[PDB]
Amino acid sequence: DIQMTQSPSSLSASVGDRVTITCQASQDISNYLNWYQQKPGKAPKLLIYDASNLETGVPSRFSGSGSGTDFTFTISSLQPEDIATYFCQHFDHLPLAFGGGTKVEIKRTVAAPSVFIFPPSDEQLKSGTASVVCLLNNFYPREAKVQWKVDNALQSGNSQESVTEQDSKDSTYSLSSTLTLSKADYEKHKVYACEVTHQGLSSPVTKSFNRGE
Amino acid sequence: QVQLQESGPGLVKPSETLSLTCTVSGGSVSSGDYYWTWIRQSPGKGLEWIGHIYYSGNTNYNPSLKSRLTISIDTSKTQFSLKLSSVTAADTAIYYCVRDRVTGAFDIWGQGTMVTVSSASTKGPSVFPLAPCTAALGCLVKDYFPEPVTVSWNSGALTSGVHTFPAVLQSSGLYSLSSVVTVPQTYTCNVDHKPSNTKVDKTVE
Amino acid sequence: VCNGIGIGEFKDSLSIDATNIKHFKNCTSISGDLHILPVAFRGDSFTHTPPLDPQELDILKTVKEITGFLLIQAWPENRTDLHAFENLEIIRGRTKQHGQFSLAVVSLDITSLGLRSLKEISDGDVIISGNKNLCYANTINWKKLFGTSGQKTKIISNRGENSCKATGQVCHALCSPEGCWGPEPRDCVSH
């Protein structure tokens, strides 16, 4: 019953910075320690085995060190493609176990989102429900505010958001907000707006449309 | 080189038996240099080592799953399977089949399969267009169960500018996601929900 | 005195099957490698070879020297240790498995190693993995047996250290902090 503790649980660094994360075992595991990289949406990939050895095909900017209880994983020059969660795994004795993981993200320049609003389709209105979608495309940082307004009435409690993982090229985020109304409630109002607030915007931007036009 | 691929149901009712089979491609499962391992991942438990099997027949199971676990190997078609009985919602996880060399490393992983434990029924999705009233359009894959749903544009021809958002769980217990494209031509999203055998090619105006 | 698997009388043999085991009687030195694969206990359906009787492994108790490496990937379910090699002393390891290992004990149900006479391992690494019942292995001081600077030991994916202490399966009080090949006071390397 070996306990693996990784530190930190998450970090942010700039491109080219030296990232160092740590893995600590509850007992002496010699050098029976491996490091894995799990990029968003993909299976974990082995980078370091036996604490120090670099797997063939892995870039040289990755390395590992340690023996016993304290181990460290180091990225010499952080790259935008290195956005992933890194795990340490022991194989001292049965059973095998992993660490909690360390999420690594990129710090970049502030980028304003591109806003799009999509009216509900006539195909969906026949089913009896209406879904209004707002889109925030390629922005940084991740923190953003999306305010729904129907006929200048602030909506809350009937919308859901979903944000993608950090892009492996431009280190940006994308967010989608879906406003859900009924068919009858949708027909009683006309103006449908989506206001967004972000650090890259000097003033809150609003994208709207009029129903049936 | 050698590739691994998972196969099995994505929805299993509670107290029943989950069954998965990994097919090894480009190699043989008859080598004494590797332990053929199953690994699962879920929110709340993280990466969890289920167990492995040797080509001699010897097995090693995780004590937390020992009572309900059974791993076998079929060297004929170069496969090895997994059986987890009496499943609960705690067994809902992404299951990987992994080649663990005796040296001690998970060097080859499968792509991972999603297994959902729920007494709910399978439901196919409804695809709706996302067109306005740099431009952008997309599709709305709404009301389906269980995960996942694969969305591609123009059968893989269009990849630049595609953003498929993580699926959100609505209050009705059904999932719903959206995939969008930014465009400066015919644009069609390809929605596949294998748990319900639902393929849809939605052309967006 | 006799050759190993893959050399001479074993030109087309992959392991010690029920056909070539009869050639190891009264043999003191093996000029090659010894392969103990799972085919020796599940049998070979192609050659109709039956499993080697677990009471027939006592033929190798006259072995003292192996020039190559010893590869053990199978063992009878009835035997809890490996005292079939209770008189093996030297493993030179001029030839190695993949060029690294001279002793490999992979995925056995044994409770102890029992290599009590093993006093020298000239060259090569030692890997011990997949043994869910094995004990006493992590206590053995392998630096006594080594002869080449840099020989490593991988005791991985085996039974826990506290698991063997729970069953009282540790070394006797009557031997040095060097380890033991079993619970008996004779299995101790030094005292």
Report the CATH number that the domain containing residue C24 is assigned in CATH.
3.80.20.20
From A93, A83, A45, A26, select the one nearest B47 (Cα to Cα).
Answer: A45
- Residue C164: enclosing H or E segment and its boundaries? helix C161-166
Inter-residue contact C115 to C126 (CB < 8 Å): no
From C33, C88, C39, select the one nearest C59 (Cα to Cα).
Answer: C88
Cα–Cα distance between B141 and B176 in angstroms, integer? 6
Residue limits of CATH 2.60.40.10 in chain B: 120-204
Same domain as A164, residue A103: no
Rg (CA), chain B: 20
Strands of the sheet with C2-3, listed across from one edge: C2-3, C29-31, C65-66, C90-91, C120-121
Inter-residue contact A85 to A43 (CB < 8 Å): no
Same domain as A69, residue A115: no
Q: What is the resolution of this structure in A?
A: 2.8
Same domain as A72, residue A41: yes
| Domain end residue (candidates: A86, A107, A128) | A107
**Mutating which of B35, B56, B73, B76 best tests the C interface, going by the most C Cβ atoms within 10 A?**
B56
3-state secondary structure of C107: coil
The string of DSSP codes covering C1-39 is: -EE-BTSGGGTT-SS--TTTGGG-TT--EEESBEEE-TH
3-state secondary structure of C136: coil
* Range A95-128 burial, b when 16+ CB lie within 10 A, else e: bbbbbbbbbbbbebeebbbbbbbbbbbeebbeee
Dihedrals phi, psi of B104, to nearest 5 degrees: 110, 65
Same domain as A202, residue A103: no
Residue with tokens 């070394």: C171
Same domain as A103, residue A2: yes
Inter-residue contact C140 to C116 (CB < 8 Å): no
Inter-residue contact B175 to B166 (CB < 8 Å): no
Position C69, amino acid: F
Q: What is the CATH number of the domain that holds A113?
A: 2.60.40.10
Binary contact (C132, A94; C-beta < 8 A): yes
- How many domains does the structure of chain A reveal? 2
Size of interface B-C (CB pairs under 8 A): 40
**What secondary structure, in 3-state letters, does B107-160 show?**
EEECCCEEEEECCCCCECCEEEEECCCCEEEEEEEEEEECCCCEEEEHHHCECC
Binary contact (B168, A160; C-beta < 8 A): yes
Q: Domain residues for A175?
A: 108-213
Dihedrals phi, psi of B146, to nearest 5 degrees: -95, -170
Name the residue of chain B whose CA is nearest to C109's CA. B58
Binary contact (A91, C160; C-beta < 8 A): no
Annotation: CATH topology of B120-204:
Immunoglobulin-like (2.60.40)
Q: Does A94 touch chain C (CB under 8 A)?
A: yes
Residues of B engaging A, defined by a Cβ cutoff of 8 Å:
46-49, 60, 62-64, 96, 103-107, 109-112, 126, 128-134, 136, 138, 140, 142, 163-168, 170, 176-178, 180, 182
Strand boundaries in chain B, DSSP class E: 3-5, 11-12, 18-25, 34-42, 46-53, 59-61, 69-74, 79-84, 93-101, 105-109, 113-117, 126-130, 135-144, 150-153, 162-164, 168-169, 175-183, 187-193, 198-204
- How do C34-36 and C70-72 pair as beta strands? parallel
| Domain end residue (candidates: A107, A136, A163) | A107
Local structure of residue A11 (DSSP, 8 states): E
- How many domains does the structure of chain C reveal? 1
Q: Domain residues for C90?
A: 1-191
Q: Does B56 touch chain C (CB under 8 A)?
A: yes
- The structure's method of determination equals X-ray
Same domain as A66, residue A51: yes
3-state secondary structure of A188: coil
